[PDB]
Amino acid sequence: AHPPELKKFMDKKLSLKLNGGRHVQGILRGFDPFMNLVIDECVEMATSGQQNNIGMVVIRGNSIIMLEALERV
């Protein structure tokens, strides 16, 4: 049960890709061995150009597909 080495992305602005062609963008604050990530200042980033900020959110690792760091870590 070794957790992932995501210490590099801690406190960095990322853009995550989800299963159903959905994307989000927020700052990472913590992770878990099951890739359960907690990102704050998250935006929904729907299919359209419209943007909706809600802030603190949680994402399930089973549905998290990819995470890119916009701040190059």
């Binding site: 062609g21 959905r22 913590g30 878990d32 359960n36 990530l37 907690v38 299919t47 603190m56």
Partner: peptide, 25 residues
């Protein structure tokens, strides 16, 4: 802060949490 503690906080707060579906947008 971990997801478990955050979920517990939202639970105590009784805030209206929205949830998305897997493979359904």
């Amino acid at each position: 802060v971990q997801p478990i503690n955050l979920i517990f906080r939202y639970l105590q707060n009784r805030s209206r949490i929205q949830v998305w579906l897997y493979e359904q947008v």
